[PDB]
């Protein structure tokens, strides 16, 4: 059948700690390949599969900044959502982002994904159209109408059909042994 790629982000605020803890886990189908741990001494995106470390420094330097910055954003997002919900700084809250894409049997594009959850409860989501957002609660509507202002429906749509499908396509052939097993 088809294939898939998923990135799983989690930013939890350690109250009384200046920066929250961050763990990023990437999977291709059901084979993890990358790791970025905030408390790790690396400060760098570490390989986790046997076929991803053949991607040279252009890849590890890329993936680090893209979620070094993804961790930074969630640092201001936990503080922004702390103001949306009238909540206090003694509380310890979690932010969970999952975005990914599905390729078909012929390298095609089949379906894209991006979902956000504040404390395990649905927040804002991406519709199949990839042109519409759905806000689960109220605070996700001040984020829904804020995102349609910068056309974030598109710039997520461009990552999903661009680097995500060509990333997933590039990995399915880089570790072609690992990813078509049974």
């Amino acid at each position, epitope marked *: 059948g088809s294939h898939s790629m998923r990135y799983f982000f989690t930013s939890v605020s350690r109250p009384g700690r200046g920066e929250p803890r961050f763990i990023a886990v990437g999977y291709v189908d059901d084979t993890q390949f990358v790791r970025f741990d905030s408390d790790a001494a690396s400060q760098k995106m570490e390989p986790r599969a046997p076929w991803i470390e053949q991607e040279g420094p252009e890849y590890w330097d890329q993936e680090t900044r893209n979620m070094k910055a993804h961790s930074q954003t969630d640092r201001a997002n936990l503080g922004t959502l702390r103001g949306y919900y009238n909540q206090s700084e003694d509380g310890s809250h979690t932010i969970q982002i999952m975005y990914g894409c599905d390729v078909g049997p012929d390298g095609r594009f089949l379906r894209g994904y991006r979902q956000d959850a504040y404390d395990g409860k649905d927040y804002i989501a991406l519709n199949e159209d990839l042109r519409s957002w759905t806000a689960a609660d109220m605070a996700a509507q001040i984020t829904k109408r804020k995102w349609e202002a910068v056309h974030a429906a*598109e710039q997520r749509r461009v990552y999903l059909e661009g680097r995500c499908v060509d990333g997933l396509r590039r990995y399915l052939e880089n570790g072609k042994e690992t990813l078509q097993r049974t």
Partner: antibody
Framework: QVQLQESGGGVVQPGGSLRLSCAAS????????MHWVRQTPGKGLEWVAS????????WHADSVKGRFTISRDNSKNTLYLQINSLRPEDTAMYYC?????????????????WGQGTLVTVSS | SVSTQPPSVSVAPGQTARITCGGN??????VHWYRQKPGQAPVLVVY???ARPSGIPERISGSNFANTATLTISRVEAGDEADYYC???????????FGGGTKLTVLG
């Protein structure tokens, strides 16, 4: 397995009208925009026209505006380019290409993949 | 709406080739690259400044900053001989703008 097949071209005389057609297969054609980009032999690429996924609007390059009209038939998965009042300048190869990203309200992002194209040559 | 490429680039096998696509504020546009060999259709090799498609080998890399986009082909093979067109969208023109094209020659 995105596949594009141009046809309908050939050798015509100036003043006549011509209809190019691009047959598409290997994707939900109703969800992507389509483009026509022509190339005069021995010269660079030149954008002609483009149409969003639905046919709502119709984008024209200035070099072919008023004379050309681009349309699409989603039920047949076929893209059409109509050329009116053929001139020696319309002598070029006409590629048809499928916008990578979906639902584009404007032809802004890269074109992948390109069809092999059809050749239109006019003379007396 | 004017993006200008060198007419041709000659490079020794195994060396590193470099094709430019100069343009006013092209660093703020999304540059793409197509390689057209004689008798075939153009093929996407670099999109959104630096991203590579699925089939493209990592030797070919993109670049785009300030007023100069750069296509870089490291370890040039004989199969890299073709014309190369960059692709932008002039927001303030409603015109997709190809460069003049560059005939990359890997001399034998």
């Amino acid at each position: 397995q995105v596949q594009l097949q141009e046809s309908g071209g050939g050798v015509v005389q100036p003043g006549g009208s011509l209809r190019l057609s691009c047959a598409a297969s290997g994707f939900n054609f109703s969800n992507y925009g389509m483009h026509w980009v022509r190339q005069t032999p021995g010269k660079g690429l030149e954008w002609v026209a483009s149409i969003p996924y639905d046919g709502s609007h119709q984008w024209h390059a200035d070099s072919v505006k008023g004379r050309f009209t681009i349309s699409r038939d989603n039920s047949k998965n076929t893209l059409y380019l109509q050329i009116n009042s053929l001139r020696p300048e319309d002598t070029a190869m006409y590629y048809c290409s499928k916008a990578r990203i979906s639902y584009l309200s404007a032809p802004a992002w890269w074109f992948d993949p390109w069809g092999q194209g059809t050749l239109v040559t006019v003379s007396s | 709406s004017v993006s200008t490429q060198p007419p041709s680039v000659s490079v020794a096998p195994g060396q590193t080739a470099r094709i430019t696509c100069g343009g006013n504020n092209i660093g703020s546009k999304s540059v793409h690259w197509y390689r057209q060999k004689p008798g075939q259709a153009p093929v996407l090799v670099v999109y959104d400044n630096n991203a590579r498609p699925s089939g493209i080998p990592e030797r070919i890399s993109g670049s785009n900053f300030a007023n100069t986009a750069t296509l870089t082909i490291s370890r040039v093979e004989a199969g890299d001989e073709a014309d190369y067109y960059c692709h932008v969208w002039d927001s303030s023109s409603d015109h997709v703008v190809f460069g003049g094209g560059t005939k990359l020659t890997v001399l034998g």
